[PDB]
Design a protein around this nucleic acid. Sequence first.
RNA 1: GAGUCGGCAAACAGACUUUGAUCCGGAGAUCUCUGAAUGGGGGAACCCACCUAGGAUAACCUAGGUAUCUUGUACUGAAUCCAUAGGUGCAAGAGGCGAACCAGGGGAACUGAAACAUCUAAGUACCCUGAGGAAAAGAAAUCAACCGAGAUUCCCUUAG
RNA 2: AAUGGGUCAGCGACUUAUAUUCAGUGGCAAGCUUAACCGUAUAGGGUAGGCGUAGCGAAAGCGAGUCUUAAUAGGGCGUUUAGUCGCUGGGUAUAGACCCGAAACCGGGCGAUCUAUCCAUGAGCAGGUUGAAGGUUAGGUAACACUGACUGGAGGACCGAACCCACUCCCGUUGAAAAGGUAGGGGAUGACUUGUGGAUCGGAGUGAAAGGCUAAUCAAGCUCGGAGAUAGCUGGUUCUC
RNA 3: AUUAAAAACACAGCACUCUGCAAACACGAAAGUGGACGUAUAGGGUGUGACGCCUGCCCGGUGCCGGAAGGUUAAUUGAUG
RNA 4: AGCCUGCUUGUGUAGGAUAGGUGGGAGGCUUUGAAGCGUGGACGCCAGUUCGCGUGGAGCCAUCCUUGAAAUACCACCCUGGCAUGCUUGAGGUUCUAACUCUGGUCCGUAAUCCGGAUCGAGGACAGUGUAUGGUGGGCAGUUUGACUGGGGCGGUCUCC
RNA 5: CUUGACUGCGAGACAGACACGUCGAGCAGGUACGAAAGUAGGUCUUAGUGAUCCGGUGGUUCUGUAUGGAAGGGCCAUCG
Lengths: 78, 77
Amino acid sequence: EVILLEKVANLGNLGDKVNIKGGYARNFLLPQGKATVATAENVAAFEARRAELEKAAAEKKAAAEARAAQLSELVVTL
Amino acid sequence: SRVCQVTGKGPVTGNNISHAHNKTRRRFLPNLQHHRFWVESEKRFVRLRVSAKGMRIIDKRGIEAVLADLRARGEKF
RNA sequence: GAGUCGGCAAACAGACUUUGAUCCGGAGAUCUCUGAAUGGGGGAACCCACCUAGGAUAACCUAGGUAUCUUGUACUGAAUCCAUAGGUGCAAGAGGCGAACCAGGGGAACUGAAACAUCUAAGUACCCUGAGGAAAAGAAAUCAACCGAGAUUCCCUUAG
RNA sequence: AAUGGGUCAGCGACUUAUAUUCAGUGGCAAGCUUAACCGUAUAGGGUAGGCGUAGCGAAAGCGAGUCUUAAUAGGGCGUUUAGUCGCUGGGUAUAGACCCGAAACCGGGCGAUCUAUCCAUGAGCAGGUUGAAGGUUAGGUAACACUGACUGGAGGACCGAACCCACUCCCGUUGAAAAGGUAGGGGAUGACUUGUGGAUCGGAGUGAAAGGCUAAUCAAGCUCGGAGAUAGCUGGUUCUC
RNA sequence: AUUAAAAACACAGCACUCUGCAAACACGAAAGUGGACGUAUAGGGUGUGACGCCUGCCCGGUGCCGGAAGGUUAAUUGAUG
RNA sequence: AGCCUGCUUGUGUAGGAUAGGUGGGAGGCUUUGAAGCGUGGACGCCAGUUCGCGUGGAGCCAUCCUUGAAAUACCACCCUGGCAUGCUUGAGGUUCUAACUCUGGUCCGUAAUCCGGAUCGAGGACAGUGUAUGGUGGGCAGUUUGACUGGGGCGGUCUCC
RNA sequence: CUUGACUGCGAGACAGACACGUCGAGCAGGUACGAAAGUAGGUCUUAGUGAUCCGGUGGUUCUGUAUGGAAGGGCCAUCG
């Protein structure tokens, strides 16, 4: 009932329509820009933007290549 | 008061028939709760006291369509 | 077209009217304070103000404004970047009263049942909210039986 | 020696509507009659409908018959000569239904100027006693215990006026007074008394509690409505033969 | 208040019991407010009623508190006939 | 608890050795069916069976060969002891944050212990509320609680022979 | 030996406010016994009981909300 927009969910995919609970669509996914309710009004707009899904979702895992190298330094003085 | 801000469901009245069929005036209250609804086109939440039927109507029609004709009626949010 | 200055209230004064009073109708002018009462208060008929314009000689006076809300619009702009809340100014409208009628919200009990609980009384009385001179309803997702009728309202029957 | 009436003069109790039944009296008559409504409108029109001309059966139905029945038997009901619409009476139904009369129940207001509690802010308590704790001082003990003297001025302390109360008698009972007076009595620096303003209200308040109080009203205020509640009860019911 | 001032109520003291704070509890269809701008030495309810000596037996009934988890058991489910 | 895959594991009387069967099927010869004893992995209504045969490209179970209520080899269909897992669902526990809650802090509207908004914190899918439902419930309510009767109360009696 | 502790009724009475109740010759259809007249519609007699409304069960010729059916209702028998 929703199109996903992130591939790091524990039971999610790239852009697959999944039918989920109403609270999970309502309260978490839609206010955080990671899913949108699968409506039958703009479906021909999704197929003319399928090459937009590759760039940011490849760059996200590519930015964590050098992001995790500064978290495990253990230089925080309590 | 206890009216849904989406549907206008207020409280209605009826009876409490016993096993000996004694009728007593009771009242039927809507299942109205407070819920914050995220609007993308305003980049904020609105918090309106709606029934669960109103929740389902938000789910079916979108928050933007329902929030369009809340204010034609002239509600708070 | 000949008297008049309202009544209880008859007289009396000073007067007015054929150059047309009084009287009657239409349109204006004035219209103190209270009261929705609306500049702020208040124990109704009272108390204290502000702003603008003009006039006034250590005192004021004239004429306008100055409520709240809703809607529309302009300007302004918090946390918070953008713009939202909010705030200021304008325009328009509202509020209160009235016997009933109407449409709704909430709704008894005595009573009857020869007691009394279901039931009745009765969706009555009452309270509340709106609207109009009427309102409401109204142009078949309606009824009829294989024939047909065609919106709604009101009345007489079918029928106690 | 039961009730009721002081008396007089006025007033004061079988109505009205709509349905119906019976009698009387009329019109039409195997038919009678219209309701709304139309009407130059008490006319005329309008016969939709109502009742009658046929009944039996729970019904389908069948019909001078029908039902029951296995029955053409029995038995029940029915079948040759009248009904309908007015009008006037007597009844009946539903309405306050002959009139007057509860205690009460419910609904909307009005009241805490009396009172019960409380809140705020004020103020009253003549006069006389008693003499707590503390202190000072002399004694007295290792300091402490503990004794006198002086001081101090406590207390829901004491006696007593104002004030507040109300235990007793008598009077008064148609009062001076819808709760008092006169003699005596209780408290009287407090859990006191009181002014002014405010708060709480009717299955609801407040109550040092008595069913007390809430405007002379209280086991559920007052007022207005439902309402002409209801009354198998009481009282009354008017001229003549 | 207006026939009962008392032996009645109150009372200091006592005990039981509730309540960890947005307290138990009360008035409020609710918001709120009191409790309380308090906090278990506090606050509510209840009974007893200074003080002195004391306050015996009973847990069957009924309540209150705790306990397994066996039977029963409501809406809702909807197998099967 | 529902479903599927290869379906491998069937050890009774008697059968060397196996019974849950249904059809093509009478011989298995794809390194035969690598074989006599047998290494190890499993289990056995226990000495019954599978694969690396100890080595190797080798005739064993003899397909009625007996026997047994149906025989093994061929090859298709399912289930049963059930191996495994997902396609699911139902009850618990723990955790998370994002709904929700806060009669917590701090900003802001604002000169406000209200109320919103933002943010931080804390709890947390609990709490709580709506609706349905069982339980408790004189806290409150509308009522009922018979007549006769040598007055009433008590006892007795109410219908029938 | 056997079911007359029958089915349909029922002339006429008794009792009686009503609802109830009591007795019953005879007729039809089928049966018991008896050779046959005939007796047999319970028991020598009078107590042994309970209205309606609700429901249950078995029939049915009836109805059956447009129609064909059902549902529900009606009548008949019966139970609580």
